[PDB]
Amino acid sequence: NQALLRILKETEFKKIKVLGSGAFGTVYKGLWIPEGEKVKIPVAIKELREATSPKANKEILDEAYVMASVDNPHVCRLLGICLTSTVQLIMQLMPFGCLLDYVREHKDNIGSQYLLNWCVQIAKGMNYLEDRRLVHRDLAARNVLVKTPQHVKITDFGLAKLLKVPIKWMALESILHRIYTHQSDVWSYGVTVWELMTFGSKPYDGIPASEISSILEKGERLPQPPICTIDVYMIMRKCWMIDADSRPKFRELIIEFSKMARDPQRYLVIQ
């Protein structure tokens, strides 16, 4: 469906300032000024480094059409694309940033209701992606954007396969065998929840990435966050089982966290 994706000209968007760096390009804050329109729309612009992919623009545009057809409240959608010597991707701006920086900036004012609400919404977005046969591969708190404090969306899924490796978020079968499934995303979701329950701590802080596979093979896992009760830590612990098919499904994670969101004081102990 070609109509869903905007083909932009260089004069239809302007970069204002730099938001951050991705794995393959810089993300800017900018304005989208559609031709023959009286609108100037705040957007996020990601410009890929030139000649970083082997695929030509014809194949990259075909892949971008898929990213422009997702229809879910908790999943980001590609708005436009500009095909010059470099590819430039345009998306709606999320004014509050990524969820990792948000829980760090607002650590003192975040209660149990917010945290369990985020776990449900992320599992809903991931469950929609599994239904659409899309594998994320890079699910982390840095890739969960905040449109408003209680409305989050998942971004940058399928980026590796559509075109330096995030070891501390990957399932063990992905580290050892380069296998990426929807159950492989369940592992990363478990780490993402761990980032939120610790209010943005770094997983395996101080441990080199080359030792991570040895640590997981020994049986070590991320420690229990202090605010988590035993019922909450066991779920994220089950996301880290060696057998990917013994991990919980996203449909089950939605139900488990939704029930806890009914009685948030019973499951998260926050001062």
Ligand SMILES: *CCC(=O)Nc1cc(Nc2nccc(-c3cn(C)c4ccccc34)n2)c(OC)cc1N(C)CCN(C)C
């Ligand atoms: C933790 C990363 C982050 O996203 N930080 C911020 C994001 C903002 N808005 C926004 N909107 C849509 C898409 C993105 C985006 C997507 N990708 C892949 C990104 C990579 C790096 C950075 C942004 C990316 N971002 C935003 O708008 C106000 C602000 C921030 N932060 C918190 C400001 C940090 N920076 C200025 C130092």
Ligand SMILES: O=C(Nc1nccs1)[C@@H](c1cc(F)ccc1O)N1Cc2ccccc2C1=O
């Ligand atoms: O554009 C993206 N992120 C951005 N952040 C700031 C501005 S754009 C990212 C992406 C966006 C989205 F809504 C959903 C899934 C995604 O994978 N995509 C899409 C795409 C298509 C073809 C080649 C590269 C990319 C690529 O990197």
